[PDB]
Amino acid sequence: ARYGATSTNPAKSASARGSYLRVSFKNTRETAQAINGWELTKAQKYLEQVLDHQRAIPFRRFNSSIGRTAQGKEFGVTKARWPAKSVKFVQGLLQNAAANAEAKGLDATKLYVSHIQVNQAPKQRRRTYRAHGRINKYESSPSHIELVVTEKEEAVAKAAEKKVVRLTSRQRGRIAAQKRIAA
Amino acid sequence: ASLPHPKIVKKHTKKFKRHHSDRYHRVAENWRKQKGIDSVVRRRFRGNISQPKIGYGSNKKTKFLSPSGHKTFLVANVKDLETLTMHTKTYAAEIAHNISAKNRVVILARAKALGIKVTNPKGRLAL
Amino acid sequence: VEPVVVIDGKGHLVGRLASVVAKQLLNGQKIVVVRAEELNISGEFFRNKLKYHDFLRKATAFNKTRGPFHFRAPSRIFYKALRGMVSHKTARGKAALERLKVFEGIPPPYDKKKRVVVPQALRVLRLKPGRKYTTLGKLSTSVGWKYEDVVAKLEAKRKVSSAEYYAKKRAFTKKVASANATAAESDVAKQLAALGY
Amino acid sequence: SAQKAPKWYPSEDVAALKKTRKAARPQKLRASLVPGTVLILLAGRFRGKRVVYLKHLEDNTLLISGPFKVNGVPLRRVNARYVIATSTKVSVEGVNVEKFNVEYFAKEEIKAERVEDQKVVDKALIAEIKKTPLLKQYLSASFSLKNGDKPHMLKF
Amino acid sequence: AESHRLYVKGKHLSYQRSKRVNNPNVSLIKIEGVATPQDAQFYLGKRIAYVYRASKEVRGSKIRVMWGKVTRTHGNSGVVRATFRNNLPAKTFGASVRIFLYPSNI
Amino acid sequence: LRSLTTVWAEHLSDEVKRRFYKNWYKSKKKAFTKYSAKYAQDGAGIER
RNA sequence: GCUUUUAGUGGGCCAUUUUUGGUAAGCAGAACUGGCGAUGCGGGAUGAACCGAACGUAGAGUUAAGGUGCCGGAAUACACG
RNA sequence: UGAUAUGAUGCCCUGACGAGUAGGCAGGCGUGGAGGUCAGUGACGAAGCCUAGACCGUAAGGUCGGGUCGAACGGCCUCUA
RNA sequence: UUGGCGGAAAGGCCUUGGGUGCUUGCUGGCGAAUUGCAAUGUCAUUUUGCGUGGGGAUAAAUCAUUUGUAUACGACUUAGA
Structure with missing residues (x-):
């Protein structure tokens, strides 16, 4: 347990995790934010279309000097990519969350991904050998991914606070004076 | 339930924060005087932060x-x-x-x- | 007094009118200036044309499209003269400059409203008679404003329609003064004259 | 010990007040407030109403008669600073206004004696109003500053 | 009647300021119809209300008031000075203000 | 110069109609269909 | 009135007036005083030294130098050219 | 200084003053440890940490609430670095 | 409702006819209070949303494919029931 900030029903959810995963954190963050909020079937078709170069992943935050493409035009962006490694890892965690929702007794037709977050894992180090006898770093930047799918539910209806009003003597003397004049 | 005391006047309700306490994380908000020779805060230029001095001392009737x-x-x-x-x-x-x-x-x-x-x-x- | 003040710009001096309209904008009065093509500037035409060319050479040397923009129309000459007198880079100054509408000629709605003048900016009340002046329309045309002839046509059309309007209105107030002439010498008229009315 | 103690304690006896020298003298009204004057109420529920003034009460108010039969204001109190004293005067000598005091308006629907005193004063007030032309209409109308009216030049 | 106004219209001009330092405690009010400081002497001490509106109803009303008074004249041209309970918030530079006369020594 | 009015003809060819389309083959081809109704009633609004 | 003890300092600079060398210099060097350094505030748009005035925290009033067409608080004041 | 109520380093009356580098001096705030004390706090939660939550002090800082946590730690009078 | 004028940003102005409402032009009758001696004592228009009920009309664009009159990539230019 101990997931991110969830505002969802824990009884009507399912969850999946992946830790210390050797993929790019930045690509995986862009695929996790391209998917956050969708119906799980829509998310799966979208990721399998991204793998087939039919749609793209809109790179919004980690997007400097990325090339341009037309496939970001459905998202209102010009820079978008197809991060296949992160896409296969994210759809693997989606498969695991769908299995967990089937095991918890949740109806697979209302599953939307309600919370997906990804943060940085401990880096894996290697050396790079540069000119004039120097050594720099060559570090993988892995990622912890986690996601909570949730049953969507209906109306968010009333019976809330009632705001007991407190108004002065000149002010309630005005209120009765209107109901005395007119109806 | 207390004694009759005068109206409590503070003369400065704002906390004296350190100069550049917001600019860096290393510089805490706990007050330290600027010792710099070119500091506009020590020189008391207009538009800069106010410094703790004895004139903001609270009334001896209503202190504490x-x-x-x-x-x-x-x-x-x-x-x-x-x-x-x-x-x-x-x-x-x-x-x-x-x-x-x-x-x-x-x-x-x-x-x-x-x-x-x-x-x-x-x-x-x-x- | 009025919610929107329409100022007839004809016969007015640019800086004095721009000063009073700048203060009226900043104090909250909505101003529309019409007939901007008939503004005046004191000093002969060649002087103010030389002044416009001195303004016309000031531009950014590395890219002139970010430079001072030399708007040529009489409304926008007047607007630059006014925008210099308002702190235009603040939210208060931008709010004041939203309270201003300047037109050359008199377009719709403001050609059926009452126009005012500002006597601390009238050239006939400020300049000494004999001091030479410049009309803003010929100056703007000389520096590259393209629409003096169209404004002339549309202003002649507006003058014909307004002349017919005033002929009808003057006949109506002739009937009104005739009917008010019979109302005198009765009781209530002499009592009104006793009460100053 | 979380705190030690104070070595001295303040005395919990409340000190008596000094003898003050601020005597209460009767209020001198401005000279435009003479009983019988038509006032303009500047504030409250009956703002803008033209209302006859009857008595200067002991609590520095004014007792007024915004004639029900004329404009609907009862026997009422007003503050003298919230009142324009005009220059139109009704003679008030036939009014039994000697009764009403500070205790009469004690708050503590309408008491029937207040209804009766209103009609009793209203009789003599209507009798003195109807002697002059257009005073009842002037009292039935409300006041409002029209466009261009500057109150500092205007004489009321 | 179609007119109900029992106050004099006015404009919140600015704070009391020098060239480069203002003072938000004192405001300058341009009263409509006042051209001299001798006409402005009538309005000294009259109570000033700035009336504004909100989205949130507080105590039955959606209209809030900041109360103040006229203190002294200003200049040679009928601008007057005014102090308040809470100072006027300087987005209202050029906003309309009600200057009453309910303590009208008249 | 300001355009105030633009009048068209009753029948436009597919060469012309095809100019107002980015995907002409997918369309229901609805261009100027309601506009030809102005020529339907006797040519009144067109001459107006 | 008197005494002891000790810190820092021992690169200075500007302004009025006097004044030397230099064609002069935001130059080099003197004399007297006042400043800056060490000093914020109002003015001179802006500026170490100029003008005004030196500073505990606040309120009211009055001014200094400087200003009052608009930016900008305050007369598109009055008078003779 | 006269007790039978508690600060004589006190309390109270009065007047004037308050810029500041280098620098001097004074009164305090905080930390590690030591002696004494409050027969002090504490697994029913010590210390720590987080907290556009509250209170006190001109300030150095002190106090409280909530969360997290699990074994020790503070107030006062002095000593010491 | 009759007709007319207005394209500068017309989107407003003038006119015909009847209906319905008010009339303070003049004269009356009744009502008002208690909001307590002031508290703006709430009367404007600005946008959006939702069910209700009455008319009305039933599309395109992008990606993918394609061309090269275009082209680093986007973009552009074509073509495809």
Whole structure:
């Protein structure tokens, strides 16, 4: 347990995790934010279309000097990519969350991904050998991914606070004076 | 429940924060005087932050009083509370941060027997 | 007094009118200036044309499209003269400049409203008679404003329609003064004259 | 010990007040407030109403008669600073206004004696109003500053 | 009647300021119809209300008031000075203000 | 110069109609269909 | 009135007036005083030295130098050219 | 200084003053440890940590609430670095 | 409702006819209070949303494919029931 900030029903959810995963954190963050909020079937078709170069992943935050493409035009962006490694890892965690929702007794037709977050894992180090006898770093930047799918539910209806009003003597003397004049 | 005291005037409700306490994380907000030769804060240029000096000293009639008009006295047990038996209009008790909730129920019960004010009566309540 | 003040710009001096309209904008009065093509500037035409060319050479040397923009129309000459007198880079100054509408000629709605003048900016009340002046329309045309002839056509059309309007209105107030002439010498008229009315 | 003690304690005896020298003298009204003057109420529920003034009460108010039969204002109190004293005067000598005091308006629907005193004063007030032309209409109308009216040049 | 106004219209001009330092405690009010400081002497001490609106109803009303008074004249041209309970918030530079006369020594 | 009015003809060819389309084959081909109704009633609004 | 003890300092600079060398210099060097350094505030748009005035925290009033067409608080004041 | 009520380093009356580098001096705030004390706090939760939550002090800082946590730690009078 | 004028940003102005409402032009009758001696004592228009009920009309664009009159990539230019 101990997931991110969830505002969802824990009884009507399912969850999946992946830790210390050797993929790019930045690509995986862009695929996790391209998917956050969708119906799980829509998310799966979208990721399998991204793998087939039919749609793209809109790179919004980690997007400097990325090339341009037309496939970001459905998202209102010009820079978008197809991060296949992160896409296969994210759809693997989606498969695991769908299995967990089937095991918890949740109806697979209302599953939307309600919370997906990804943060940085401990880096894996290697050396790079540069000119004039120097050594720099060559570090993988892995990622912890986690996601909570949730049953969507209906109306968010009333019976809330009632705001007991407190108004002065000149002010309630005005209120009765209107109901005395007119109806 | 307190004495008749004058209107409490503070003369500076704003906390004197350090210069560039917001600019860096290393520079804490706890006040330190600027010692620089070129500092506009030490030189008191206009538009810069105000510095603590003795003119902001609170009134000697209304210094150390809470807004209720009592001086806060820290209390660890029933014995330290009972020093404020004959001093209810000047001093108010505050139960300390480490007094356990099986002891504070005794301390608040003795405080209402002597009528002593407690300024934190909701601490560690098992409601 | 009025919610929106329409100022007839004809016969007015640019800086004095721009000063009073700048203060009226900043104090909260909505101003529309019409007939901007008939403004005046004191001093002969060649002087103010030389002044416009001195303004016309000031531009950013590395990219002139970010430079001072030399708006040529009489409304926008007047607007630059006014925008210099308002702190235009603040939210208060931008709010004041939203309370201003400047037109050359008199377009719709403001050609059926009452126009005012500002006597601390009238050239006939400020300049000494004999001091030479410049009309803003010929100056703007000389520096590259393209629409003097169209404004002339549309203003002649508006003058014909307004002349017919005033002929009808003057006949109507002739009937009104005739009917008010019979109302005198009765009781209530002499009592009104007793009460100053 | 979480705190030690103060070595001295303040005395919990409340000190008595000094003898003050601020005597209460009766209020001198401005010279435009003479009983029988038509006032303009500047504030409250009956703002803008033209209302006859009857008595200067002991609590520095003014007792007024915004004639029900004329404009609907009862026997009422007003503050003298919230009142324009105009220059139109009704003679008030036939009014039994000697009764009403500060205790009469004690708050503590309408008491029937207040209804009766209103009609009793209203009789003599209507009798003195109807002697002059257009005073009843002037009293039935409300006041409002029209466009261009500058109150500092206007004489009321 | 179609007119109900019992106050004099006015404009919140600015704070009391020098060239480069203002003072938000004192405001300058341009009263409509006042051209001299001798006409402005009538309005000294009259109570000033700035009336504004909100989205949130507080105590039955959606209209809030900041109350103040006229203190002294200003200049040679009928601008007057005014102090308030809470100072006027300087987005209202050029906003309309009600200057009453309910303590009208008249 | 400001365009105030633009009048068209009753029948436009597919060469012309095809100019107002980015995907002509997918369309229901609805261009100027309601506009030809102005020529339907006797040519009144067109001459107006 | 008197005494002891000790810190920092021992690169200075500007302004009025006097004044030397130099064609002069935001130059080099003197004399007297006042400043800056060490000093914020109002003015001179802006500026170490100029003008005004030196500073605990605040309120009211009055001014200094400087200003009052608009930016900008305050006369598109009055008078003779 | 006269007790039978508690600060004579006190309390109270009065007047004037308050810029500041280098620098001097004074009164305090905080930390590690030591002696004494409060027969002090504490597994019914010590210390720590987080907290556009509250209170006191001109300030150094002190206090309280809530969360987290699990074994020790503070107030006062002095000593010491 | 009759007709007319207005394209500068017309989106407004003038006119015909009857209906319905008010009339303070003049004279009356009744009502008002208690909001307590002031508290803006709430009367404007600005946008959006939702069910209700009455008319009305039933599309395109992008990606993918394609061309090269275009082209680093986007973009552009074509074509495809």
